[PDB]
Design a protein around this ligand. Structure first.
Ligand code: NA
Ligand code: NA
Ligand SMILES: [Zn+2]
Ligand SMILES: [Zn+2]
Ligand SMILES: [Zn+2]
Ligand SMILES: [Zn+2]
Ligand SMILES: [Zn+2]
Ligand SMILES: [Zn+2]
Ligand SMILES: [Zn+2]
Ligand SMILES: [Zn+2]
Lengths: 166, 166
């Protein structure tokens, strides 16, 4: 309903389908730089149930829910309310999700996810990071057959593991 | 020497530095489609000993050697001389490098490396594939401490392993 007005504002070529570029330009990451294109790509492919390279209005109500939900999480854990998420808050956010990860390891996470290069993670980078972690966990989980947080794999199962990431 | 004439032909903006776009356009992959940009990016970052985003003439003599050498390998193993490399020939090429990999696993390799979508791997895709495999092997090797083609890793060492790929 109110969602239709949003859709019409975002669908700038009035095609009836919201493309990557369109969704990108309707989202801010709180740093006055374009929203992470990879993040946009992931959100599109998530809800696009055709091979459309975009989302229609029905699919878009899903996207709108997804982004709003990700905003709740991000604002909850950015408690000094700066707009970025820091080492401590990232530790909190992933701890809230159920990850049990060492403090130093969050050094790597920040280095890997933060496009801004400022020791902190923006909203767009934050979504991708979490998405990438779900994926790595899904894969790991296929190989940790007795569920004790350990895997023994051969060279070939490793390669096919890394290749099933994609 | 003769290399200088090549460099001048490739350096189209006459800057004295060969950019990504420039190198790309001076290379064919034998399929009348642009040479894999990722492949170009890798070759650049390999020989660029500044943070230049390109190569000067000195560095370029390295690149020229690297590409010619990769051409020898590719032509050796594309023995039906089509321009593509197939499952059997890929099996040969990597076997020549010292990889001991199962026949079915080469299904995954072709699916993963072939941008053309035709069950075969082009010259540009072939270089990247091999490069990606060297990297995965280097990493694996750091973790296979007793050198028997097996690793046991925890969840956190796995994440940091996958993250050291990049
Ligand atoms: Na296990
Ligand atoms: Na081992
Ligand atoms: Zn549109
Ligand atoms: Zn914060
Ligand atoms: Zn902060
Ligand atoms: Zn176990
Ligand atoms: Zn140039
Ligand atoms: Zn062939
Ligand atoms: Zn063939
Ligand atoms: Zn062992």
């Amino acid at each position: 309903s109110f969602l239709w007005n949003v859709f019409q504002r975002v669908d700038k070529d009035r095609s009836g389908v919201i493309s990557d570029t369109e969704l990108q330009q309707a989202l801010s990451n709180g740093t006055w730089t374009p929203f992470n294109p990879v993040t946009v790509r992931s959100i599109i492919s998530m809800f696009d149930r055709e091979n459309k390279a975009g989302v229609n209005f029905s699919e878009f109500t899903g996207v709108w829910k997804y982004i709003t939900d990700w905003q709740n999480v991000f604002r909850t854990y950015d408690r000094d309310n700066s707009g970025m998420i820091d080492k401590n808050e990232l530790k909190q956010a992933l701890s809230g999700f159920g990850y049990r990860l060492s403090d130093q390891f969050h050094d790597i996470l920040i280095r890997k996810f933060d496009r801004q290069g400022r020791g902190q993670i923006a909203f767009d980078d934050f979504i991708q990071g979490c998405i990438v972690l779900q994926r790595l966990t899904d894969i790991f989980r296929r190989y940790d057959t007795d569920q004790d947080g350990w895997i023994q794999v051969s060279y070939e199962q490793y390669l096919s593991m890394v290749f099933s990431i994609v």
